[PDB]
């Protein structure tokens, strides 16, 4: 397995520079005073299509040759990669078919269809979406662009962390949300380059801690689809490419409860005035849980996305 | 009445440069495509203490001499000026007494007390807060720093628009929220300097359209405290300083219903991933109402603040 390196992340910055947002970095006096540290939040919830996924989607599709682009692409996603792929595809004039979980946030399904993506659904807790993807693409001659286990995809995701380090310099610790591992693996590549001594932390919801288990065990652990509000991290196992990198460049994998996620979501709205989806609350929820360790340090927090159904979001804020 | 000019706004930029945030400017593809225009949002909901008020408070208090600072200051506010004054006062070691409406968002009262401000309350719909302010300050020897009708205060507020023009250049139109007129007057001064031909629009909630009435009539119109969710724009009349400027440098005053505000609040959360308080939704709500007029133009939208009680905010999002 030929693994991507930091070079690919740097090259990805160039391919997306034309359409991606150089998301702002926010800081909070309450957080810094509370943590007795300097905390920097990379806001991918302000990225095109509301999440960091646009980076990986565009970097991947941009490397498709003329025949591939015209032939069309296929992907499976919990919603954000689906939107990112649809948007990127429309921009490049590429036909796109997307396989989405039936219980995906309606806002994610709607944006995907609006961007021009043909949606097909699956049962997140019982269906084998990859098997569906493979067969469909094999039968229709479509190029599969995985939501995370692909060199171009993960290298692209790493551009967010790249921008964070270039804007604020080396950090003592970096917290990243963890689903399949594309964001974490890409971020780890950036971290090792800009700050080789940065502690890189992956964060998964407690019910879906396969990644953590894999990291401890040394091999990929498979679990049944986890029940959690972090709808963007219900993966059953890590990707092969992503795990190979996570295994060597990640320092630890933490978990937080849905309860902790909700408190974090309320914190973001109330104190930082931003809308963050549950999955985007993993990194900060974990950081809060270990504030004692972050005293007098510089911490980076990746805010992966803000795509939620408003009705659902209002409900969370009400807890 | 000696009116402040753009010079004061420029000098205010210097006095606050040490503690104020140079809030980011956001743009949205949905908005630009919907409006067929380039729309720039100045996010004061990311300012220190969650609103644009920090600018005017700091600029004013920074111009207090040693005796005045030690003597302490007093103010009356619906909540944001209260927080801004409290924060600014703590930074400068100034004792601060604040008069707040009993039905002010609990988050605003709490932050004011947390910043170290002594709070005293009044009945927004029946009490004469200015009379209370005058007597209390006269009896205790305190310097009154008005929430808007004061040269330093309004000049300070104008620094947000100053940053907006310096960052994106002249605009065809600028929408600003309107309560007492400090933000609008200050913004108008900045607009006339950076883009003398910019259309400057003030926006008030329909029930509290005294400002609009004043602008048409040519004199200050007084109304009973308006009932509206725009808790930051329930002023009964415009300030003397602010109206004198609004009268000469503002092109029109528009109104929007609370219903329109709620739709705007949901839009900000859903599409732009930011938390905006009802009062902060006036400017954009109006702009949407006249999109036809903004076609193929460059529009500036001031997002004045994001201070809301989460419970209340969740409730609005649920409509
Ligand atoms: C790819 C998947 N999106 C997931 C997601 C993550 C986790 O990313 P990784 O799966 O490990 O790469 C973190 N935050 C958010 C907001 C989202 O969506 C998809 O959408 O298909
Ligand atoms: C000063 C007052 N704050 C009001 C406010 C406005 C309107 O400002 P002007 O009163 O005309 O200067 C617009 N948006 C927000 C969010 C707020 O608070 C106060 O807090 O005392
Ligand atoms: Mg997992
Ligand atoms: Mg009014």
XYZ file of C-alpha atoms and ligand atoms in Angstrom:
682
model
C 0.000 0.000 0.000
C 1.659 3.221 -1.199
C 0.929 5.821 1.470
C 0.548 9.541 0.744
C 3.023 11.861 2.462
C 3.018 15.557 3.332
C 3.966 16.301 -0.294
C 0.473 15.234 -1.355
C -1.148 17.542 1.187
C 0.908 20.463 -0.111
C -0.027 19.586 -3.692
C -3.668 19.346 -2.603
C -3.521 22.941 -1.321
C -2.790 24.025 -4.892
C -5.539 21.996 -6.560
C -8.234 23.379 -4.266
C -6.954 26.974 -3.939
C -9.359 28.037 -6.675
C -12.626 27.015 -4.968
C -12.000 26.245 -1.282
C -12.379 28.671 1.607
C -9.351 29.504 3.742
C -11.520 29.118 6.833
C -10.867 31.549 9.708
C -9.247 30.630 13.010
C -11.223 31.656 16.065
C -10.020 32.105 19.634
C -11.999 32.596 22.852
C -11.069 34.475 26.025
C -13.346 32.246 28.102
C -11.696 29.108 26.744
C -8.154 30.430 27.152
C -8.901 31.590 30.706
C -10.707 28.330 31.509
C -7.914 26.191 30.035
C -5.084 28.497 31.090
C -3.878 28.020 27.508
C -4.063 29.392 23.976
C -6.723 27.520 22.010
C -7.157 27.933 18.250
C -10.270 26.680 16.454
C -10.016 25.876 12.719
C -13.585 26.467 11.483
C -14.325 24.004 8.692
C -17.998 24.570 9.448
C -17.359 27.668 7.297
C -15.874 25.603 4.451
C -17.768 25.267 1.164
C -20.765 22.939 1.742
C -20.388 23.333 5.520
C -17.618 20.848 6.295
C -13.991 19.964 5.708
C -14.957 17.296 3.139
C -14.868 19.736 0.219
C -11.064 19.651 0.403
C -10.713 15.914 -0.133
C -13.506 15.720 -2.709
C -12.092 18.473 -4.912
C -8.492 17.267 -4.620
C -9.584 13.772 -5.693
C -11.941 14.716 -8.536
C -9.471 17.281 -9.880
C -7.035 14.446 -10.514
C -9.483 12.584 -12.732
C -8.616 12.547 -16.442
C -11.060 13.596 -19.152
C -12.422 10.079 -19.708
C -12.930 9.471 -15.981
C -14.702 12.786 -15.491
C -17.087 12.117 -18.371
C -17.620 8.535 -17.221
C -18.955 9.829 -13.904
C -18.136 9.076 -10.285
C -19.747 7.171 -7.444
C -19.431 7.408 -3.682
C -20.981 6.373 -0.376
C -21.223 8.833 2.498
C -22.974 9.736 5.746
C -23.691 13.094 4.154
C -20.789 15.542 4.118
C -18.578 13.735 1.598
C -21.810 13.288 -0.372
C -22.359 17.060 -0.490
C -18.686 17.813 -1.150
C -18.553 15.312 -4.004
C -21.787 16.640 -5.498
C -20.553 20.236 -5.334
C -17.105 19.391 -6.712
C -18.691 17.267 -9.457
C -21.003 20.059 -10.574
C -18.072 22.466 -10.759
C -16.062 20.040 -12.914
C -19.070 18.885 -14.955
C -18.840 15.334 -13.612
C -21.943 13.103 -13.301
C -22.210 11.921 -9.688
C -24.097 9.075 -8.010
C -24.210 9.066 -4.205
C -25.170 6.308 -1.751
C -26.471 7.763 1.521
C -27.782 6.334 4.813
C -31.563 6.599 5.093
C -31.306 8.270 8.511
C -28.862 10.931 7.343
C -29.673 14.536 8.311
C -32.296 15.721 5.799
C -30.223 18.862 5.231
C -27.356 16.722 3.953
C -29.542 14.701 1.593
C -31.238 17.855 0.294
C -27.974 19.703 -0.432
C -26.614 16.622 -2.219
C -29.669 16.464 -4.492
C -29.563 20.228 -4.940
C -25.930 20.130 -6.054
C -27.056 17.668 -8.710
C -26.074 14.345 -7.165
C -28.172 11.235 -7.788
C -28.941 9.777 -4.380
C -29.522 6.105 -3.562
C -30.018 5.077 0.064
C -28.908 2.307 2.380
C -29.649 1.135 5.895
C -26.739 2.451 7.959
C -27.139 -0.203 10.645
C -27.583 -3.283 8.455
C -26.476 -2.701 4.852
C -22.967 -3.126 3.460
C -22.536 0.183 1.663
C -19.130 -0.682 0.232
C -20.468 -3.856 -1.336
C -23.254 -1.735 -2.840
C -20.739 0.819 -4.084
C -18.455 -1.759 -5.701
C -21.247 -3.614 -7.486
C -23.026 -0.485 -8.698
C -19.830 1.127 -10.000
C -18.687 -2.176 -11.569
C -22.057 -2.553 -13.265
C -22.207 1.068 -14.441
C -18.536 1.761 -15.055
C -18.147 4.548 -12.499
C -15.046 5.627 -10.606
C -15.387 5.188 -6.858
C -14.190 8.115 -4.760
C -14.200 6.775 -1.145
C -15.264 9.087 1.719
C -11.880 8.591 3.433
C -9.816 5.487 2.533
C -8.126 7.004 -0.522
C -4.790 8.868 -0.811
C -6.156 11.933 -2.622
C -9.152 12.205 -0.307
C -7.190 12.030 2.946
C -4.369 14.210 1.610
C -6.976 16.827 0.791
C -8.498 16.796 4.274
C -5.034 17.534 5.650
C -5.059 20.993 4.083
C -7.199 22.317 6.951
C -4.519 21.506 9.520
C -1.908 22.850 7.088
C -3.678 26.206 7.056
C -3.998 26.122 10.852
C -0.246 25.636 11.395
C 0.732 28.202 8.758
C -1.566 30.729 10.430
C -0.639 30.185 14.085
C 2.552 28.123 14.046
C 3.427 24.871 15.878
C 1.013 23.665 18.542
C 1.437 21.510 21.624
C -1.626 19.413 20.813
C -4.127 18.976 17.997
C -7.571 17.440 18.503
C -9.284 15.931 15.471
C -12.633 14.193 14.967
C -12.426 10.544 13.902
C -14.722 8.550 11.651
C -13.011 6.526 8.929
C -9.736 8.355 9.526
C -9.374 10.569 6.460
C -9.387 13.820 8.421
C -7.129 12.464 11.170
C -4.632 10.826 8.802
C -4.395 13.913 6.602
C -4.076 16.161 9.653
C -1.379 13.918 11.127
C 0.698 14.310 7.968
C 0.452 18.098 8.239
C 1.271 18.062 11.948
C 4.381 15.922 11.556
C 5.646 18.405 8.983
C 4.831 21.746 10.648
C 5.217 20.555 14.234
C 6.864 17.089 14.460
C 6.515 17.229 18.222
C 2.803 18.066 18.276
C 0.592 15.594 20.105
C -2.022 14.466 17.589
C -5.270 13.193 19.089
C -8.097 11.412 17.329
C -11.521 11.546 19.008
C -14.404 9.107 18.515
C -17.815 8.817 20.162
C -17.614 6.190 22.937
C -20.108 3.807 21.302
C -18.064 3.902 18.102
C -14.558 3.471 19.476
C -13.353 0.946 16.880
C -10.606 3.388 15.930
C -9.364 3.543 19.526
C -9.494 -0.257 19.752
C -7.570 -0.530 16.478
C -4.928 1.935 17.680
C -4.351 -0.077 20.881
C -4.522 -3.523 19.248
C -2.345 -2.761 16.235
C -4.875 -4.018 13.703
C -8.271 -2.925 12.416
C -11.131 -3.721 14.779
C -14.630 -4.096 13.341
C -17.813 -3.194 15.211
C -21.515 -3.043 14.455
C -22.694 0.406 13.380
C -22.633 2.482 16.585
C -25.698 4.313 17.899
C -24.682 7.923 18.502
C -25.693 11.458 17.518
C -22.260 11.877 15.916
C -23.775 10.826 12.582
C -20.499 11.544 10.820
C -18.480 9.040 12.873
C -20.599 5.872 12.791
C -18.037 4.012 10.686
C -17.651 0.325 11.555
C -13.864 0.374 11.086
C -10.928 2.502 9.963
C -9.666 2.641 6.399
C -6.511 0.761 5.418
C -4.653 3.838 4.143
C -5.809 5.992 7.065
C -4.991 3.419 9.730
C -1.486 2.885 8.329
C -0.812 6.574 8.881
C -2.775 6.926 12.127
C -0.789 3.977 13.435
C 2.513 5.801 12.996
C 1.728 9.499 13.319
C -1.079 9.667 15.913
C -0.378 9.802 19.638
C -3.716 8.717 21.089
C -7.419 8.125 20.385
C -9.953 9.462 22.892
C -13.705 9.050 23.285
C -16.507 11.252 24.603
C -20.193 10.577 25.291
C -23.112 12.041 23.333
C -23.872 13.942 26.541
C -20.463 15.611 26.336
C -21.100 16.372 22.666
C -24.349 18.177 23.458
C -22.716 20.289 26.136
C -20.023 21.200 23.625
C -22.599 22.072 20.971
C -24.306 24.432 23.424
C -20.940 25.915 24.348
C -20.098 26.667 20.726
C -23.439 28.363 20.140
C -23.541 30.273 23.425
C -19.900 31.310 23.840
C -18.422 31.256 20.345
C -21.586 32.032 18.392
C -21.171 29.217 15.854
C -23.292 26.260 14.752
C -21.449 22.940 15.034
C -22.827 19.511 14.191
C -22.505 16.805 16.888
C -19.658 15.092 15.055
C -17.839 18.424 14.877
C -17.946 18.585 18.676
C -15.769 15.522 19.316
C -12.371 17.222 19.274
C -13.298 20.021 21.691
C -15.337 17.753 23.967
C -12.226 15.610 24.461
C -9.946 18.624 24.969
C -12.235 19.886 27.730
C -12.149 16.437 29.345
C -8.360 16.710 29.674
C -7.931 20.430 30.336
C -5.522 19.695 33.198
C -3.056 18.338 30.626
C -3.371 21.407 28.384
C -2.402 23.995 31.018
C 0.069 26.610 29.724
C 0.085 25.075 26.245
C -1.075 25.976 22.733
C -3.930 23.812 21.501
C -5.496 23.373 18.087
C -9.115 22.294 17.733
C -10.526 21.184 14.385
C -14.199 22.089 13.964
C -15.009 19.631 11.190
C -18.511 20.729 10.264
C -21.792 22.465 10.946
C -24.341 20.524 8.893
C -27.348 19.669 11.051
C -31.102 19.689 10.647
C -32.155 22.923 12.365
C -35.041 21.140 14.096
C -32.594 18.568 15.451
C -30.120 21.303 16.387
C -32.814 23.265 18.247
C -33.632 20.070 20.128
C -30.017 19.526 21.196
C -29.696 23.129 22.380
C -32.812 22.564 24.496
C -31.261 19.797 26.593
C -24.155 70.115 19.353
C -20.609 69.344 18.172
C -20.894 66.266 15.967
C -18.135 63.666 15.605
C -16.721 63.176 12.109
C -14.847 60.360 10.384
C -11.663 61.561 12.121
C -13.076 60.319 15.425
C -13.828 56.895 13.968
C -10.257 56.622 12.693
C -8.917 57.689 16.089
C -11.220 55.131 17.719
C -9.616 52.361 15.635
C -6.328 53.168 17.369
C -7.691 53.262 20.917
C -9.320 49.843 20.600
C -6.654 48.105 18.468
C -5.162 46.613 21.623
C -8.226 44.654 22.811
C -10.840 44.489 20.034
C -11.241 41.696 17.501
C -10.853 42.471 13.804
C -13.946 40.380 13.119
C -13.925 38.266 9.936
C -15.995 38.973 6.840
C -18.060 36.045 5.633
C -19.567 35.453 2.204
C -22.088 32.843 1.043
C -22.511 31.203 -2.362
C -26.211 30.619 -1.706
C -26.751 34.279 -0.855
C -24.733 35.574 -3.806
C -26.539 33.213 -6.192
C -29.916 34.033 -4.625
C -29.270 37.791 -4.724
C -27.301 37.744 -7.974
C -24.845 39.945 -6.066
C -21.758 39.939 -3.861
C -22.791 40.072 -0.206
C -20.289 40.633 2.608
C -21.203 39.989 6.246
C -19.244 41.836 8.968
C -19.485 39.451 11.947
C -19.615 41.505 15.136
C -21.188 38.469 16.779
C -17.521 37.399 16.961
C -16.469 40.657 18.646
C -15.343 40.632 22.284
C -18.437 40.093 24.492
C -20.442 38.932 21.459
C -21.471 42.238 19.888
C -20.234 45.411 18.250
C -20.732 47.389 21.489
C -17.224 46.642 22.764
C -15.884 49.149 20.227
C -17.861 52.121 21.507
C -17.453 51.192 25.173
C -13.670 50.886 25.000
C -13.218 53.999 22.856
C -15.267 56.015 25.364
C -13.766 54.669 28.598
C -10.236 54.928 27.199
C -10.727 58.678 26.943
C -11.508 59.020 30.638
C -8.816 60.733 32.721
C -7.366 59.216 35.885
C -9.867 60.915 38.208
C -12.852 59.878 36.078
C -11.688 56.276 35.867
C -11.237 56.036 39.630
C -14.540 57.811 40.236
C -16.341 55.041 38.352
C -18.824 55.011 35.494
C -22.535 54.411 35.087
C -24.658 53.323 32.151
C -28.069 52.022 31.114
C -28.385 49.301 28.494
C -30.563 46.548 27.043
C -27.620 44.237 27.618
C -24.832 44.468 25.052
C -23.530 47.929 25.965
C -23.851 46.703 29.560
C -21.513 43.773 28.860
C -19.134 45.870 26.752
C -18.902 48.543 29.440
C -18.360 45.947 32.164
C -15.607 44.227 30.177
C -13.911 47.495 29.203
C -14.184 48.744 32.798
C -12.553 45.630 34.226
C -9.685 45.954 31.760
C -9.104 49.600 32.729
C -9.756 49.031 36.444
C -12.859 51.230 36.415
C -15.761 50.634 38.850
C -18.955 50.187 36.820
C -22.651 50.405 37.695
C -25.134 49.191 35.077
C -28.900 49.725 34.785
C -30.552 46.880 32.863
C -34.118 46.013 31.802
C -35.627 43.257 33.941
C -36.610 41.245 30.855
C -33.141 41.368 29.318
C -31.710 38.055 28.067
C -30.368 36.267 31.165
C -27.113 35.634 29.296
C -26.563 39.382 29.012
C -27.255 40.049 32.688
C -25.024 37.146 33.742
C -22.044 38.237 31.613
C -22.388 41.796 32.934
C -22.254 40.579 36.544
C -19.449 38.186 35.660
C -17.357 40.979 34.156
C -17.726 42.737 37.496
C -20.510 45.212 36.775
C -22.993 46.165 39.493
C -26.437 45.640 38.012
C -29.608 47.546 38.909
C -32.799 46.838 36.970
C -35.661 48.784 35.455
C -38.974 48.047 33.794
C -38.270 48.433 30.077
C -41.893 49.193 29.230
C -42.696 51.686 31.991
C -39.569 53.096 33.658
C -37.563 56.119 32.527
C -34.064 54.659 32.528
C -32.364 57.928 31.623
C -33.983 59.710 34.544
C -32.734 56.865 36.751
C -29.257 57.131 35.255
C -29.011 60.901 35.714
C -30.201 60.881 39.321
C -28.076 57.915 40.374
C -24.912 59.297 38.767
C -25.627 62.802 40.141
C -26.131 61.355 43.609
C -23.057 59.110 43.447
C -20.748 61.233 41.326
C -20.393 58.796 38.430
C -19.659 59.521 34.784
C -22.479 58.472 32.481
C -21.419 56.609 29.351
C -24.615 56.439 27.202
C -25.348 53.282 25.160
C -25.423 55.335 21.933
C -26.070 59.106 22.184
C -22.446 60.090 22.810
C -19.707 61.086 20.320
C -17.076 58.616 21.553
C -19.569 55.761 21.749
C -20.983 56.193 18.245
C -17.572 56.947 16.730
C -16.363 53.672 18.189
C -19.217 51.644 16.707
C -18.232 53.000 13.296
C -14.964 51.067 13.381
C -16.778 47.882 12.320
C -17.888 49.433 9.033
C -14.409 50.955 8.681
C -12.884 47.483 8.825
C -15.494 46.188 6.369
C -14.668 48.829 3.732
C -10.905 48.494 4.201
C -11.225 44.735 3.726
C -13.551 44.621 0.711
C -13.613 48.156 -0.681
C -16.575 50.425 -1.558
C -20.033 48.867 -1.537
C -23.253 49.706 -3.341
C -25.333 49.382 -0.178
C -24.815 48.886 3.545
C -27.520 47.527 5.851
C -27.256 48.354 9.546
C -29.410 47.502 12.566
C -31.048 50.477 14.286
C -31.835 51.020 17.947
C -30.745 54.361 19.388
C -28.621 55.075 16.322
C -25.059 54.707 17.594
C -24.179 51.865 15.236
C -25.930 53.459 12.255
C -24.501 56.945 12.827
C -20.969 55.633 13.304
C -21.313 53.373 10.265
C -22.659 56.252 8.172
C -19.554 58.299 8.962
C -17.333 55.441 7.788
C -19.402 54.889 4.650
C -19.323 58.530 3.584
C -15.540 58.423 3.849
C -14.730 55.080 2.185
C -17.653 55.077 -0.240
C -19.423 58.485 -0.410
C -21.875 57.026 -2.891
C -22.835 53.990 -0.808
C -26.511 53.690 0.055
C -26.684 53.506 3.846
C -29.773 51.796 5.244
C -30.946 51.695 8.832
C -33.293 48.844 9.793
C -35.730 48.779 12.719
C -38.330 46.239 13.821
C -41.753 47.349 12.519
C -43.269 47.845 15.987
C -40.348 50.087 16.917
C -40.114 52.279 13.833
C -39.637 55.595 15.659
C -36.329 56.004 13.841
C -38.032 55.632 10.455
C -40.729 58.101 11.522
C -38.050 60.541 12.691
C -36.145 60.216 9.410
C -39.286 61.022 7.381
C -40.578 63.779 9.683
C -37.283 65.592 10.194
C -37.498 65.556 13.982
C -37.308 62.954 16.734
C -40.481 60.911 17.130
C -41.200 59.300 20.498
C -43.069 56.021 20.938
C -43.959 53.708 23.794
C -41.472 50.875 24.270
C -42.130 48.518 21.339
C -42.984 44.841 21.817
C -40.590 42.837 19.654
C -38.037 40.028 19.933
C -35.371 42.479 18.747
C -34.535 43.211 22.390
C -31.632 45.402 21.327
C -33.789 47.841 19.337
C -36.664 48.658 21.703
C -35.523 52.261 22.115
C -38.351 54.799 22.362
C -36.513 57.398 20.258
C -33.225 58.199 18.536
C -30.354 60.006 20.209
C -29.708 63.675 19.452
C -26.130 63.157 18.241
C -27.040 60.030 16.264
C -30.111 61.542 14.630
C -28.172 64.639 13.541
C -25.829 62.370 11.609
C -28.454 59.859 10.462
C -30.441 62.808 9.153
C -27.646 63.853 6.805
C -25.731 60.687 5.965
C -28.396 57.944 5.873
C -30.409 57.191 2.748
C -33.379 55.307 4.181
C -34.792 53.490 7.225
C -36.523 50.146 6.668
C -38.539 47.843 8.914
C -39.047 44.083 9.109
C -41.398 41.916 11.182
C -40.344 39.574 13.992
C -41.446 36.796 11.636
C -38.860 37.949 9.100
C -36.268 38.109 11.875
C -36.879 34.487 12.849
C -36.551 33.298 9.274
C -33.275 35.197 9.056
C -32.029 33.698 12.318
C -32.724 30.208 10.963
C -30.999 31.122 7.711
C -27.854 32.246 9.509
C -27.693 29.053 11.550
C -28.576 26.680 8.716
C -26.711 28.234 5.782
C -23.923 30.296 7.327
C -23.423 28.266 10.498
C -23.489 31.246 12.876
C -25.573 32.224 15.902
C -27.205 35.642 15.522
C -29.471 37.356 18.032
C -32.848 38.624 16.732
C -31.670 42.232 16.724
C -28.640 41.182 14.685
C -31.006 39.858 12.017
C -32.564 43.212 11.094
C -30.066 44.287 8.440
C -30.138 41.018 6.479
C -33.896 40.557 6.855
C -34.385 43.935 5.162
C -31.819 43.201 2.438
C -33.664 39.993 1.567
C -36.932 41.944 1.407
C -35.455 44.150 -1.330
C -33.260 41.666 -3.192
C -34.615 42.897 -6.536
C -32.882 46.230 -5.885
C -29.555 44.579 -5.020
C -29.150 42.638 -8.282
C -25.618 42.848 -9.733
C -24.399 44.965 -6.819
C -22.022 44.637 -3.864
C -23.795 44.622 -0.516
C -22.524 44.923 3.033
C -24.447 43.393 5.922
C -23.599 44.238 9.528
C -24.196 41.323 11.901
C -24.362 43.321 15.122
C -24.441 40.537 17.686
C -25.041 36.974 18.778
C -26.020 37.255 22.444
C -29.158 35.218 23.097
C -30.381 32.854 25.776
C -29.770 29.412 24.261
C -33.198 28.223 25.417
C -34.784 31.201 23.668
C -32.598 30.659 20.601
C -33.567 26.973 20.417
C -37.197 28.074 20.570
C -36.799 30.506 17.667
C -35.058 27.875 15.540
C -38.022 25.577 16.204
C -40.566 27.877 14.561
C -16.311 10.906 5.317
C -17.567 11.093 6.116
N -17.462 12.235 7.051
C -17.149 12.278 8.318
C -17.022 13.430 9.290
C -15.930 13.373 10.245
C -14.948 12.200 10.280
O -14.048 12.028 9.158
P -13.353 10.824 8.865
O -14.452 9.854 8.484
O -12.578 10.087 9.754
O -12.569 11.102 7.709
C -15.764 14.459 11.201
N -16.662 15.528 11.168
C -17.756 15.685 10.281
C -18.625 16.890 10.371
C -17.990 14.613 9.275
O -18.977 14.580 8.344
C -18.750 11.328 5.072
O -19.423 12.353 5.102
O -19.026 10.484 4.198
C -26.867 50.254 22.736
C -27.755 49.058 22.917
N -27.559 48.058 21.845
C -28.217 47.852 20.734
C -28.029 46.849 19.619
C -28.243 47.319 18.262
C -28.647 48.764 17.963
O -27.684 49.813 18.233
P -28.013 51.189 18.358
O -28.845 51.250 19.622
O -28.758 51.941 17.455
O -26.779 51.861 18.591
C -28.073 46.391 17.153
N -27.706 45.072 17.429
C -27.471 44.511 18.709
C -27.082 43.080 18.837
C -27.626 45.399 19.893
O -27.446 45.052 21.192
C -27.404 48.431 24.341
O -27.016 47.273 24.442
O -27.510 49.096 25.390
Mg -15.356 4.855 15.279
Mg -36.838 52.062 16.897
